[PDB]
Motif scaffolding. Structure first.
Motif, PDB file in Angstrom:
ATOM      1  N   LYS A  82       0.849  -1.192   0.000  1.00 42.84           N
ATOM      2  CA  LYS A  82       0.000   0.000   0.000  1.00 42.84           C
ATOM      3  C   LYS A  82       0.886   1.245   0.000  1.00 42.84           C
ATOM      4  O   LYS A  82       0.549   2.277   0.591  1.00 42.84           O
ATOM      5  CB  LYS A  82      -0.949   0.023   1.209  1.00 42.84           C
ATOM      6  CG  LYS A  82      -2.079   1.039   1.068  1.00 42.84           C
ATOM      7  CD  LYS A  82      -2.961   1.093   2.304  1.00 42.84           C
ATOM      8  CE  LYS A  82      -4.097   2.090   2.132  1.00 42.84           C
ATOM      9  NZ  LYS A  82      -4.897   2.248   3.373  1.00 42.84           N
ATOM     10  N   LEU A  83       2.034   1.124  -0.655  1.00 40.71           N
ATOM     11  CA  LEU A  83       3.015   2.203  -0.739  1.00 40.71           C
ATOM     12  C   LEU A  83       3.617   2.242  -2.142  1.00 40.71           C
ATOM     13  O   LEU A  83       3.064   2.864  -3.045  1.00 40.71           O
ATOM     14  CB  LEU A  83       4.140   2.046   0.305  1.00 40.71           C
ATOM     15  CG  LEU A  83       3.846   2.573   1.719  1.00 40.71           C
ATOM     16  CD1 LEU A  83       2.933   1.632   2.489  1.00 40.71           C
ATOM     17  CD2 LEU A  83       5.144   2.787   2.478  1.00 40.71           C
ATOM     18  N   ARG A 117      -2.561  -4.343  -8.981  1.00 36.57           N
ATOM     19  CA  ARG A 117      -3.645  -5.011  -8.277  1.00 36.57           C
ATOM     20  C   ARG A 117      -4.987  -4.317  -8.517  1.00 36.57           C
ATOM     21  O   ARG A 117      -5.652  -4.598  -9.510  1.00 36.57           O
ATOM     22  CB  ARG A 117      -3.327  -5.111  -6.778  1.00 36.57           C
ATOM     23  CG  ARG A 117      -4.088  -6.213  -6.044  1.00 36.57           C
ATOM     24  CD  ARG A 117      -3.914  -7.570  -6.712  1.00 36.57           C
ATOM     25  NE  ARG A 117      -4.821  -7.736  -7.845  1.00 36.57           N
ATOM     26  CZ  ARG A 117      -4.477  -8.260  -9.020  1.00 36.57           C
ATOM     27  NH1 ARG A 117      -3.235  -8.672  -9.239  1.00 36.57           N
ATOM     28  NH2 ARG A 117      -5.385  -8.361  -9.980  1.00 36.57           N
ATOM     29  N   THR A 118      -5.381  -3.396  -7.636  1.00 34.04           N
ATOM     30  CA  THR A 118      -6.693  -2.765  -7.767  1.00 34.04           C
ATOM     31  C   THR A 118      -6.755  -1.367  -7.141  1.00 34.04           C
ATOM     32  O   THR A 118      -6.727  -0.373  -7.867  1.00 34.04           O
ATOM     33  CB  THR A 118      -7.816  -3.677  -7.212  1.00 34.04           C
ATOM     34  OG1 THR A 118      -9.068  -2.983  -7.192  1.00 34.04           O
ATOM     35  CG2 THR A 118      -7.502  -4.208  -5.821  1.00 34.04           C
ATOM     36  N   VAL A 119      -6.824  -1.270  -5.813  1.00 36.25           N
ATOM     37  CA  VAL A 119      -6.955   0.029  -5.159  1.00 36.25           C
ATOM     38  C   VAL A 119      -6.081   0.130  -3.915  1.00 36.25           C
ATOM     39  O   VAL A 119      -5.257   1.029  -3.810  1.00 36.25           O
ATOM     40  CB  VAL A 119      -8.417   0.349  -4.767  1.00 36.25           C
ATOM     41  CG1 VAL A 119      -8.477   1.650  -3.979  1.00 36.25           C
ATOM     42  CG2 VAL A 119      -9.314   0.430  -5.995  1.00 36.25           C
ATOM     43  N   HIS A 173      -2.431   1.735  -4.554  1.00 37.26           N
ATOM     44  CA  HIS A 173      -2.732   3.025  -3.958  1.00 37.26           C
ATOM     45  C   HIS A 173      -1.780   4.123  -4.429  1.00 37.26           C
ATOM     46  O   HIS A 173      -2.211   5.096  -5.047  1.00 37.26           O
ATOM     47  CB  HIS A 173      -2.703   2.917  -2.434  1.00 37.26           C
ATOM     48  CG  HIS A 173      -3.809   3.679  -1.777  1.00 37.26           C
ATOM     49  ND1 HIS A 173      -3.598   4.736  -0.921  1.00 37.26           N
ATOM     50  CD2 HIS A 173      -5.152   3.524  -1.854  1.00 37.26           C
ATOM     51  CE1 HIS A 173      -4.762   5.198  -0.502  1.00 37.26           C
ATOM     52  NE2 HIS A 173      -5.721   4.479  -1.054  1.00 37.26           N
ATOM     53  N   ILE A 174      -0.493   3.985  -4.132  1.00 36.28           N
ATOM     54  CA  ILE A 174       0.468   5.044  -4.449  1.00 36.28           C
ATOM     55  C   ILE A 174       1.314   4.686  -5.668  1.00 36.28           C
ATOM     56  O   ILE A 174       1.207   5.334  -6.713  1.00 36.28           O
ATOM     57  CB  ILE A 174       1.400   5.338  -3.251  1.00 36.28           C
ATOM     58  CG1 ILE A 174       0.582   5.699  -2.007  1.00 36.28           C
ATOM     59  CG2 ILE A 174       2.374   6.460  -3.589  1.00 36.28           C
ATOM     60  CD1 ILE A 174      -0.280   6.933  -2.177  1.00 36.28           C
ATOM     61  N   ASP A 175       2.160   3.670  -5.508  1.00 33.19           N
ATOM     62  CA  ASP A 175       3.068   3.194  -6.560  1.00 33.19           C
ATOM     63  C   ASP A 175       4.264   4.114  -6.716  1.00 33.19           C
ATOM     64  O   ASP A 175       4.279   5.231  -6.193  1.00 33.19           O
ATOM     65  CB  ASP A 175       2.365   3.035  -7.918  1.00 33.19           C
ATOM     66  CG  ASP A 175       3.299   2.530  -9.000  1.00 33.19           C
ATOM     67  OD1 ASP A 175       3.869   1.433  -8.837  1.00 33.19           O
ATOM     68  OD2 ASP A 175       3.429   3.207 -10.035  1.00 33.19           O
ATOM     69  N   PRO A 178       0.276   1.621 -10.629  1.00 38.10           N
ATOM     70  CA  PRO A 178      -0.174   1.011  -9.380  1.00 38.10           C
ATOM     71  C   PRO A 178      -1.041  -0.221  -9.628  1.00 38.10           C
ATOM     72  O   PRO A 178      -0.911  -1.239  -8.945  1.00 38.10           O
ATOM     73  CB  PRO A 178      -1.003   2.115  -8.703  1.00 38.10           C
ATOM     74  CG  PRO A 178      -0.803   3.345  -9.527  1.00 38.10           C
ATOM     75  CD  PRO A 178      -0.428   2.877 -10.903  1.00 38.10           C
ATOM     76  N   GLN A 179      -1.934  -0.121 -10.608  1.00 41.09           N
ATOM     77  CA  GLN A 179      -2.849  -1.211 -10.909  1.00 41.09           C
ATOM     78  C   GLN A 179      -2.258  -2.103 -11.990  1.00 41.09           C
ATOM     79  O   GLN A 179      -2.776  -3.185 -12.283  1.00 41.09           O
ATOM     80  CB  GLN A 179      -4.208  -0.665 -11.353  1.00 41.09           C
ATOM     81  CG  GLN A 179      -5.326  -1.689 -11.263  1.00 41.09           C
ATOM     82  CD  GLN A 179      -6.655  -1.157 -11.754  1.00 41.09           C
ATOM     83  OE1 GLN A 179      -6.990  -1.285 -12.933  1.00 41.09           O
ATOM     84  NE2 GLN A 179      -7.416  -0.550 -10.857  1.00 41.09           N
ATOM     85  N   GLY A 180      -1.159  -1.652 -12.565  1.00 42.87           N
ATOM     86  CA  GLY A 180      -0.488  -2.416 -13.588  1.00 42.87           C
ATOM     87  C   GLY A 180      -0.372  -1.653 -14.884  1.00 42.87           C
ATOM     88  O   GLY A 180      -1.266  -0.827 -15.176  1.00 42.87           O
TER      89      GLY A 180
END
Length: 29
Positions: free
Chosen positions: A8-9, A14-16, A20-22, A27-29
């Motif tokens: 989550k950093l 993934r999704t949310v 989240h940050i990336d 972040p989601q790909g």
């Protein structure tokens, strides 16, 4: 914020919550 990078950093893909940050690029790909 929750755990650490790739979670989550500095995300991965993934999704949310784990998208989240990336680094900034994908972040989601």
């Amino acid at each position: 914020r929750k755990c650490n990078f790739l979670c989550k950093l500095k995300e991965k893909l993934r999704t949310v919550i784990t998208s989240h940050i990336d680094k900034v690029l994908r972040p989601q790909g």
